[PDB]
Amino acid sequence: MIESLADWSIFTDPDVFGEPVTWTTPPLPDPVPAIFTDASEDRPATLGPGVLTIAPTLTLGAAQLPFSPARNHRCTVRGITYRVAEVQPDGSGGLRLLLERV
Amino acid sequence: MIESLADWSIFTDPDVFGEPVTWTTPPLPDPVPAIFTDASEDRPATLGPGVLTIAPTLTLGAAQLPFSPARNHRCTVRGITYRVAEVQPDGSGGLRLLLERV
Amino acid sequence: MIESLADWSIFTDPDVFGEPVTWTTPPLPDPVPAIFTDASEDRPATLGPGVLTIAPTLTLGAAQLPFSPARNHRCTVRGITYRVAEVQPDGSGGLRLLLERV
Amino acid sequence: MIESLADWSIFTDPDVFGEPVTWTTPPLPDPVPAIFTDASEDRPATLGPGVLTIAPTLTLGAAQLPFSPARNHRCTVRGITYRVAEVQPDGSGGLRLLLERV
Amino acid sequence: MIESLADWSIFTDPDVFGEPVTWTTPPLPDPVPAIFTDASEDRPATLGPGVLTIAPTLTLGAAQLPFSPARNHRCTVRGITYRVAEVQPDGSGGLRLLLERV
Amino acid sequence: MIESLADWSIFTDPDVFGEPVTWTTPPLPDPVPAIFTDASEDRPATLGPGVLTIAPTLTLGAAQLPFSPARNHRCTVRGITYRVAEVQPDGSGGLRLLLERV
Amino acid sequence: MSEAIIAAARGRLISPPFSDATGDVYRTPEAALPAIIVELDYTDAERISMGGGFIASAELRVEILAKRDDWSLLTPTPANTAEGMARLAALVRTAILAPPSDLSGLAWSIAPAGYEFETERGETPLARATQSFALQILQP
Amino acid sequence: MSEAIIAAARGRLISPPFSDATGDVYRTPEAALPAIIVELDYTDAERISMGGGFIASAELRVEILAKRDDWSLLTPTPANTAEGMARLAALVRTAILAPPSDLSGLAWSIAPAGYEFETERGETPLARATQSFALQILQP
Amino acid sequence: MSEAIIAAARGRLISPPFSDATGDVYRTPEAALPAIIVELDYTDAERISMGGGFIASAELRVEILAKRDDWSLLTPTPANTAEGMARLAALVRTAILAPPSDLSGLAWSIAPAGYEFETERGETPLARATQSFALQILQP
Amino acid sequence: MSEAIIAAARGRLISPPFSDATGDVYRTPEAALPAIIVELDYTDAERISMGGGFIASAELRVEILAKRDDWSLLTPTPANTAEGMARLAALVRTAILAPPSDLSGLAWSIAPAGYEFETERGETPLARATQSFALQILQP
Amino acid sequence: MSEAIIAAARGRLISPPFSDATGDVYRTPEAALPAIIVELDYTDAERISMGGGFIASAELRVEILAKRDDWSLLTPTPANTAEGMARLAALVRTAILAPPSDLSGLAWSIAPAGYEFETERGETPLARATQSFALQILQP
Amino acid sequence: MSEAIIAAARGRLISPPFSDATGDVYRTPEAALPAIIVELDYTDAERISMGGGFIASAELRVEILAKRDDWSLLTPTPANTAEGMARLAALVRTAILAPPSDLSGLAWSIAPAGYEFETERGETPLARATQSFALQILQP
């Protein structure tokens, strides 16, 4: 648990890798930095070739986060609204979120 | 077997990686340090997408431990009670425990 | 996002690895460099041994690209026309295109 | 074959990684060094979750032994009797034994 | 494409790894060097144990090659005739050929 | 092909790794060195647990070998007769033999 | 008409005090410990009458995921998976296979095609129960 | 005659306001959120009459991929996969299984062989629906 | 009624002197060397009478895991898996397939659907035995 | 007699203007874009008469691989896999299932056992079509 | 009664001069080159009479593993797997399917369900032979 | 009696000028380009008469592996796998299914159960042919 503040600040470092996001949910004031990663995901179709869909996730410092790490919360990245669809612990107190686009 | 005491003390080192836990079972007095690790585990459902469940385990120095490495014992980590559901040897005399949440 | 211009310029570097291509679609003036990679792909046949087909792709700096990263666009590599069949994000803002030969 | 004596001696060095064992069967009259390794073993059940069983394999210098590497022999490790259930060559003249607990 | 001539000359280097071959097809005069590699291939039989067959291939510098990289051409390695059964691009302009023995 | 003599002599080096063997077939006079490797092979049984069988092979320098690299030849390793059951090229001119025990 | 039958099911299975979510891929929650989901599944088919009609063979699958006191409503040992799953299932069976006609009518036969209890190892133990009900519905 | 039946299908399924692409391997788009594809599939066969004729057993598979408001045309909760898929499917079923004779004639029987709803986790949620229709067509 | 049948089984199989645990995922112990577990499994079904009734086809699976002297109660060579498994199984078969009516009644037929002996290599040797019993139970 | 039937097929399918290669493992070319291959496959069998005779159940599989204008001979949209495959297949079906007696005689029944269109993603798009024809041939 | 039938088998197959071990997981020896193992396997079942009885369908599997001169007892070429396996098997078949009544009685039918020869590549060549014998035994 | 039937086969298939090896695991040669192997396989069984008899359902599998001029004995294009395999197979079929009584008698029916040609890519091309012949043999 030594990492705490330092660790969270370091990666988040804006304009290095941390893209600032704000939780449009009022539970969070004061913009937070987090790592945004999206890639291509190929989803198959039983008969079809499939469709190339895209999935974006936020990796954040959970311990740093105040408020509630909670599903169904509302957040926005770069001005696009995302409902926090899912959260899962990696056990470092650094959780990964999955954000619905809508 | 050279490692014994030294090895157990080193990792356990509190506030480095060892989170102190106490066995609420009276067989153990005097708080013990152990490594707590939990992560996300995806458990599937035959028809369903699945559910994201979480599993936490304690890695401890078995040799160091006095008393009994025994299933059904009672222990608490960070004030939350855990029954020691399972124990399995890694053969280093460093066993891993699995702790039920209840 | 630090890489932006520098990163795109470096790899594209003509005659190093970047083969200049031009988007015959009028949306793009001013020739662009991109990495052309093609290899052998073995496509099977249910009863047959299969056929050795070839697939060529362009790896480009998406952020650098102005205009539209869009499917159905027209582009030519080394004087051979390619319709941009597919595009998929690797999440670096460096997308990979797949170009139909026709 | 160059290693021979040297190789056998060094690993088994007592209190480093060689736990001395005595063969219960009388053919060997001298305490013999070897490497004891046991770990969690997964033995499933067709319908059941399974059972966590254990196994202990001895690794010894086969060329070092002056007497029959033979199944059905009797040996004891740390005062617990083990029948030598199985032996298999790794081809280094360093064979691994599997010892039944009984 | 920087490698071109240099790259092809270097590997081909006779008596290092490049075994000179000549295309008995008249389209090619002036002996060419290429890397000859053959190994054992186990081909199975549905009921049978299988048969150990051997497959030999030539790795050559395609760009260096003049004439035509074409199937059905005739070539000989070390005085044994080979029809060029198949050719497939690795995309480096270094293609690999498969040569029928006959 | 640069390795030829040197390469074969080096590994074979007696009492390093090369165990001298002689081809009891009269086609070969003058003892030859080769690398003998045997390990445990588990062969299964459809209903049974299986049987631990052992397979020994000789790795030799084929190019160095005069006479004939031929199946059905007779050879002996350490005074035990082996029919050369199988030979397969690794393509280095260093072939591996499989020797029947009988 | 899947929607209507699913709607009947939606009304019929909403009664246990917990939300029912069907076909939500992204969702895989542990917060909703007691879990219910109803699926209309597939419909195979054959002709009816001369001059027009169709009927279908259809399967409805009901799945329940649960932990802790949800099992322990009344009787002891519902932690045992079998007792717990059965305890929830039989009542569920009666819910869907209830006497009301509307529920029965679009469904025609409501026979239990299959039953199961399954075990997944979470801190809190989670167990899956399946209750296939076969309904033959006239194609509209 | 697959082309003709496929052509009838092509006319019959082009009505939803979105393009239908069949058998395009390279294509796997997400831009065309509402998605339709019709496949004539396979034809097994048996003799007709004495002196000549053949008939086939054939399967037509219709697949729909969708996200968001495409589900939400009118009624609430079409985000629920089952309701949404059913909502599009039943009308599709009527489209193909329509009264017009030409569509019916080359098809003979038009029974729904199977139905399904499937879930793939994309940002926008994508769901796959299959509507197998069995048509027996006389071999020309 | 699985719980009741399982309860009958619970009473009927608790007699061997060792605990029976059913569906405990987390648990996989070696300390409880003699091991027993009973599963009600699945129920398929068909209609009864005109005006109402249902019956089910059901399978009950009994599994035994054992080591050492548990095999060696009396006769020699029960270490041999077959003899040992049979020795425990036949009595178990009689336990469940016993004469008492209550046990028999909810069960109707109690035929042995299947039998098996299995081998897993632990220091102490562990062997698995399965005794499927098919019971047809009227759905309540 | 596979060779003879294959020979009839060889004559019957050589007409499309492109070479037909059967069972060439090493060969997997893309240069021969329009592709045809005919396989006699397997023969199962039963007795004929008393005193001697044998007959076989046999399957003939025809496969076509194609790209670009080969699909586009006349009608529009043969790029669509289904139309294109059907377009080549029906004529092929007539070729093999032709009126000439010799072709028909050794073949007896020539029914289409199966049909398929398949998609593989090459720069030029390649599509596979299968036309199983079942021929029962008297064993010589 | 598996133990008794296995015991009969144990007596009946102990005659070849080598030990028979059944279900020993840990054991996988090559020292016992000639190898024999007999398994009672599974028993499916049906009712007998009115008022009580049960009968079972049961399979007995016999497996033989061998190398070298064990094959070469008398005739030449028993190294050939087929001849060697057959040579041991037929006599084994007669052993189990022998005339003595006790062996036959608990077994009722003793038909050979299946036969096989298998090849595993050891220095000494090892070959596996299976001789399934189907015995229907009245459940005690 | 597998050995005898195999012996008949051994005599019957030794005629092609190349050695036949059956069940040699270690052996997998390419030097013996033309390759033949005969397997007696499995025997299922049923009772004969009242008072004693048994009969078996048995399969004999013949496999041929070949390259180059072995295919090209006379007619052109035997490189084509189908023609080549058929060319060797039909004569082989006649060899085993020959008129001589001894060969026919222990075999009873000699029908071709199956046929196949297979392709493996070696420098010299190797092709596998299977000729299952079903023989019902009275158990001695």
In which residue are the tokens 């097929």 written? J9
Contact H123 A54 (CB under 8 A): yes
Residue for token digits 């608790």?
A: I14
Cβ contacts of I113 on chain K, cutoff 8 Å: 44-45
How would DSSP label each residue in B24-78? -STT--S-EEEEEEEEEEEE--SSS--EEEEEEEEE--TTT--S---TT-EEEET
Q: Which residues of K touch D86 (CB under 8 A)?
A: 26-28
Q: How far is CA J50 from CA E65, G81, I106, J53, L100, in A?
A: 69, 64, 58, 8, 18
Out of G7, G44, G46, the one facing H114 most closely (by C-beta) is G44
Chain G residues with CB under 8 Å of A71 CB are 29, 31
Contact A53 H27 (CB under 8 A): no
Distance, in Å, from the CA atom of F53 to the CA atom of F44, rounded to the nearest integer, reads 10
Q: Are J136 and J108 in contact (CB under 8 A)?
A: yes
Interchain contact I121–D (C-beta under 8 A): yes
- For residues H22 and H42, the answer to whether their CB atoms sit within 8 Å is no
For F71, phi then psi, to 5°, come to: -70, 155
Residue with the two structure tokens 């480096």: E92
| 8 Å CB contact between I65 and D51 | yes
CA nearest to I73, candidates I58, I62, I83, I64: I83
Are the CB atoms for L86 and L104 separated by under 8 Å? Answer: no
CB G95 within 8 A of CB G13: yes
CB contact under 8 A, E90 and C40: yes
* 8 Å CB contact between D100 and K26: yes
DSSP single-letter state for residue J69: G
Task: Kindly list the residues from chain I whose CB atom is less than 8 angstroms away from the CB atom of residue G120.
Answer: 25
Looking at beta carbons, which residues of chain A come within 8 Å of B54? 89
L112 burial (CB, 10 Å; 0-12 / 13-18 / 19+) is: buried
Cβ–Cβ contact A71 with G under 8 A:
yes
What is the DSSP track for L64-121? EEE-GGGT-SSSS--SSHHHHHHHHHHHHHHHHT-S-HHHHHHH---EEEEEEEEEE-
Task: Give Cα separations from B75 to D73, G77, L56 (angstroms).
Answer: 43, 23, 66
Q: b or e along K90-115 (b: 16 or more beta carbons within 10 Å of the residue's beta carbon)? A: bebbebbbeeeeebbebbebbbbbbb
For residue H34, the Cα-to-chain-centroid distance in whole angstroms is: 14
Kindly report the number of other CB atoms within 10 A of residue L74's CB atom. 6
Neighbours of E69 (CB within 10 A): 15
Closest by alpha carbon to A32, among A48, A6, A13, A51?
Answer: A13
Chains B and K touch (3+ CB pairs under 8 A): no
Q: After which residues is chain F broken (C to N over 2.5 A)?
A: none
How many beta-carbon pairs below 8 A join chains D and K? 9
CA–CA gap between residue B96 and residue K134 (Å, rounded):
48
Q: What distance in Å separates the CA atoms of residue H62 and residue F12, rounded to the nearest whole number?
A: 68
CB within 8 A of G11, min separation 6: which ones?
Answer: none
For F44, other C-beta atoms within 10 Å of its C-beta total: 13
By the 8 A CB rule, do G84 and G78 touch?
Answer: yes
Burial B88-100 (b: 16+ CB within 10 A, else e): bbebebbbbbbbb
| CB-CB contact of F57 with F95 (8 Å) | no
L87 closest CB neighbour out of J3, J39, J47: J3
Entry field: residues in chain B: 102
Q: Are strands F32-43 and F51-59 parallel, antiparallel or unpaired?
A: antiparallel
Which structure tokens are listed for H92? 């599709």
- Interface with chain G: mutation pick from B41, B47, B98, highest number of G CBs within 10 Å: B47
Q: How far is J23 from chain H (nearest CA, A)?
A: 24
Q: Is A37 on the interface with C (CB under 8 A)?
A: yes
Q: Which of J23, J40, J43 sits opposite L112 (nearest CB)?
A: J43
Put simply, the answer to whether I23 touches G127 (Cβ < 8 Å) is yes
Can you tell me the distance from the alpha carbon of D82 to that of D24, in angstroms, rounded to the nearest whole number?
9
Query: How far apart are the CA of E102 and the nearest CA of chain F, in angstroms?
Result: 20
**Burial class of residue I101 in the structure, from the number of CB atoms within 10 Å of its CB (0-12 exposed, 13-18 middle, 19+ buried):** exposed
Contact status, residue G131 vs residue I42, Cβ threshold 8 Å = no
Nearest to H133 by CA among G140, J86, G44: G44
Inter-residue contact E42 to E54 (CB < 8 Å): no
CB K75 within 8 A of CB K111: no
Answer yes or no: do L26 and F71 touch at CB < 8 A. no
Q: Does E100 contact J26 at a Cβ distance shorter than 8 Å?
A: yes
Distance CA C101, CA J123 (A): 5
Residues of K in Cβ contact (< 8 Å) with I96: none
Instruction: Give the dihedral sign, CA G116/G117/G122/G125.
Output: positive
Q: Give CA–CA dist F72/K48, Å, rounded.
A: 62
Q: Is A43 on the interface with B (CB under 8 A)?
A: no
Within 8 A of G31 by CB-CB distance, chain A residues are: 71
CB-based burial label for F26 (10 Å; 0-12, 13-18, 19+): exposed
Secondary structure class of A74 (helix, strand, coil): strand
Interface probe, candidates K26, K28, K30, chain D, greatest D C-beta count within 10 A: K26
User: C-alpha distances in angstroms, J38 versus F83, J64, L118?
Assistant: 45, 9, 14
The distance from CA E50 to its chain's CA centroid, rounded to whole angstroms, is 26
Cα distances from F68 to residues F10, F25, F65, J109, in angstroms, run 22, 11, 8, 57
Q: In terms of C-beta distances under 8 Å and separation of at least 24 residues, what long-range contacts does F40-45 make, across chains too? A: F40/D88, F40/D89, F40/D90, F40/D91, F41/K122, F42/K28, F43/K120, F43/K121, F43/K122, F43/K126, F44/K120, F45/K63, F45/K65, F45/K120, F45/K128
Q: Centre a 10 Å sphere on the Cβ of residue K57 and count the other Cβ atoms it contains.
A: 14
Please say whether the beta carbons of G45 and H113 come within 8 A: yes
CA–CA min distance C2, chain A (Å): 7
Q: Chain C partners of J20 at a C-beta cutoff of 8 Å?
A: none
The helix, strand and coil proportions of chain D, stated in percent and rounded to the nearest 5, come to 10, 45, 50
Is L133 exposed, middle or buried (CB count within 10 Å of its CB: 0-12, 13-18, 19+)?
buried
Angle at I74 between CA I73 and CA I75, to 5 degrees: 125
How far apart CA I132 and CA I109 sit, in angstroms, is 12
C2 neighbourhood in chain A, CB within 8 Å: 15-16
Whether K81 and K88 have beta carbons less than 8 Å apart is answered as no
How many angstroms separate the CA atoms of L3 and K82, rounded? 7
Residues in I touching G119 (Cβ below 8 Å):
23-25
Per DSSP, I130 falls in state: E
Q: What residues contact K89, with CB distance under 8 A and at least 6 apart?
A: K64, K115, K129, K131, L2
Instruction: In whole angstroms, give the CA distance from residue A31 to residue A24.
Output: 10
Point out the residue among I82, I112, I125 whose CB comes nearest to the CB of K22.
I82
Query: Cβ of A66: how many Cβ atoms within 10 Å?
Result: 11
Q: Say which amino acid occupies C40.
A: S
Chain H residue numbers with beta carbons less than 8 Å from the beta carbon of G24 are 81, 119, 125
Contact indicator for I85, K1 with CB cutoff of 8 Å: no
Q: Exposed, middle or buried by CB within 10 Å (0-12, 13-18, 19+), for L84?
A: buried
Q: Is C54 on the interface with J (CB under 8 A)?
A: yes
- Which residue has 């078995």 as its token pair? B62
Could you count the other beta carbons within 10 Å of the beta carbon of residue K24? Answer: 18
Residues ≥6 apart with Cβ < 8 Å to G110: G96, G97, G104, G133, G134, G135
For residue L66 the two structure tokens come to: 């070949």
Q: CA geometry: angle at H38 spanning H37 and H41, to 5°?
A: 130
CA within 13 Å, CB half, F65? 22
Distance from the Cα of residue H92 to its chain's centroid: 7
* Residues within 8 A of F (CB atoms), E 63-102 only: none
Chain L closest CA to E57's CA: distance in Å? 10
CB spacing of F71 vs L29 below 8 angstroms:
yes
Question: Which residue, among B27, B23, B26, has the nearest Cα to B81 in the 3D structure?
Answer: B23
Q: Shortest CA distance to C53 belongs to which of J31, B32, D15?
A: J31
Q: Considering only CB atoms, which residues of chain L are within 8 Å of chain J?
A: 75, 80-83, 85-87, 89-90, 109, 111-117, 119-121, 125, 127
3-class secondary-structure state, position E62: coil
- H/E element, L10: helix L2-13
- The CA distance from G40 to G44, in Å, is 12
Phi, psi angle pair for A60, to nearest 5°: -135, 170
For I83, phi then psi, to 5°, come to -65, -45
Run of H or E including H127: strand H126-135
Backbone torsions φ then ψ of J71, nearest 5 degrees: -65, -45
Q: Is there a contact between C100 and H26 if contact means CB atoms under 8 Å apart?
A: yes
Q: State the burial class of residue C15 (Cβ atoms within 10 Å of its Cβ: 0-12, 13-18, 19+).
A: exposed
CA distance J120 to J102: 36
Measured in degrees and rounded to the nearest 5, phi and psi for residue D43 equal -125, 105
Of J1, J23, J45, the CB nearest to L81: J23
CA-CA distances (angstroms) from residue I3 to G98, G112, G116, I45? Answer: 21, 17, 13, 18
Residues 6+ apart with CB under 8 A from L65: E45, E48, E51, L33, L34, L35, L126, L127, L128, L129
> Could you give the angle at the alpha carbon of H92 between the alpha carbons of H90 and H97, nearest 5°?
95
Question: Which resolution in angstroms does this entry have?
Answer: 6.6
- F74-77 and G35-39 as β-strands: parallel, antiparallel, unpaired? unpaired
- The I-side interface with K (CB below 8 A) comprises 80-83, 85-87, 89-90, 109, 111-117, 119-121, 125, 127
* CA-based nearest distance A78→chain C, Å: 13
Is residue J25 within 8 angstroms of chain E, CB to CB?
Answer: no
Query: CB burial class (10 A; 0-12, 13-18, 19+) of residue K81?
Result: buried
* Alpha carbon distance H48, H54 (integer Å): 5
With vertex at residue H100, the alpha carbon angle to CA H95 and CA H106, rounded to the nearest 5 degrees, is 95
* Cα L78 from Cα G126, distance rounded (Å): 64
CA H41, CA H134: separation in Å to the nearest integer? 10
Contacts for F86 with CB less than 8 Å, ≥ 6 apart: E52, F71, F97, F98, L26, L27, L28
State the amino acid at position B14 in one-letter form. Answer: P
Residues paired with A53 in a beta bridge: A41
Question: Is J31 an 8 Å CB contact of chain C?
Answer: no
Core vs surface per residue C37-69: b (16+ CB within 10 A) or e: ebebbebebeebbebbbbbbbbbbbbbbbeeee
Gyration radius (Cα) of chain D, Å: 15
DSSP J94: H
- Distances from the Cα of L124 to the Cαs of E53, E99, K78, L32, L120, in angstroms? 8, 10, 33, 12, 10
From D44, D51, D55, residue closest to I29, measured CB to CB: D51
Q: What span, in angstroms and rounded, lies between the C-alpha atoms of J70 and F46?
A: 51
